[PDB]
């Protein structure tokens, strides 16, 4: 999520 934080890293796409």
């Amino acid at each position, epitope marked *: *999520s*934080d*890293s*796409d």
Partner: antibody, heavy 120, light 108 residues
Framework: EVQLVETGGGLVKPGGSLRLSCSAS????????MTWIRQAPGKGPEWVSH????????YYADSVRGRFTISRDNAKSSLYLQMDSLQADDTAVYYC?????????????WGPGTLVTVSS | EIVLTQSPATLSLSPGERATLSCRAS??????LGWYQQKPGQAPRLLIY???SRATGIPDRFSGSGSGTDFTLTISRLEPEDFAVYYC?????????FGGGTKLEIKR
């Protein structure tokens, strides 16, 4: 596809100054940590500095603290590295790299790099 | 800081062989370790994050293993395009650090 392009590298005398810019496009620049990485000739890469998407959280490697200043203009989708009191051992290719939204631990998206040479 | 020791410094293999690249950390970094490939005049290219999780688009012959202090990058059978410099990178603890690199060259 994420696009990053560093500019501003060049030759500078020790003690001189240089301002690097990284232009970002095709993503939501303000939502991501941005990072500066540098690589000396023949060496591996070295982390330089982090800046949060808001610009309010900033970290520096000890070797550049007090000499380098990271900033960003989210309106212009632009990352900057202001380099003062440059030293011979700052000679390196400088890269900007996109982090995560809340962390910047490793890097998928890198610019092509800009060469900074510090020499008398 | 955490020091990343990469061995061997240079690795000489023929296309088609299997390459095993080792990265040793001075302290445990858990599984927070990545691998990059670098070709002349280009930025590093992420191959592996989280010690073993492949990055997007990376061919399946690239695999990473290990945890804690001893990590390995394996190329199942080397393609002509795979001869390059390879770096490990830890992010278990700040400051984030890279290894010194392994250069994979063509044996003839």
């Amino acid at each position: 596809e994420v696009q990053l392009v560093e500019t501003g590298g060049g030759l500078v005398k020790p003690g001189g100054s240089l301002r690097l810019s990284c232009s970002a496009s095709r993503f939501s620049f303000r939502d991501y940590y941005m990072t500066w990485i540098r690589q000396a000739p023949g060496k591996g890469p070295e982390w330089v500095s982090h800046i949060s998407g808001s610009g309010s959280t900033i970290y520096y490697a000890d070797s550049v603290r007090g000499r380098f200043t990271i900033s960003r203009d989210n309106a212009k989708s632009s990352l900057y590295l202001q380099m003062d009191s440059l030293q011979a051992d700052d000679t390196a290719v400088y890269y900007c790299a996109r982090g995560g939204r809340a962390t910047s631990y490793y890097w998928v998206h890198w610019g092509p790099g800009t060469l900074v040479t510090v020499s008398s | 800081e955490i020091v990343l020791t990469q061995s061997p410094a240079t690795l000489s293999l023929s296309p088609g062989e299997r390459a095993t690249l080792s990265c040793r950390a001075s302290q445990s970094v858990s599984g927070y370790l990545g691998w990059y490939q670098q070709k002349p005049g280009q930025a590093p290219r992420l191959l592996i994050y989280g010690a073993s999780s492949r990055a997007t688009g990376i061919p399946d012959r690239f695999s990473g293993s290990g945890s804690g202090t001893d990590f390995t990058l394996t190329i199942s059978r080397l393609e002509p395009e795979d001869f390059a410099v390879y770096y490990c990178q830890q992010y278990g603890s700040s400051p984030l650090t890279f290894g010194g690199g392994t250069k994979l060259e063509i044996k003839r």
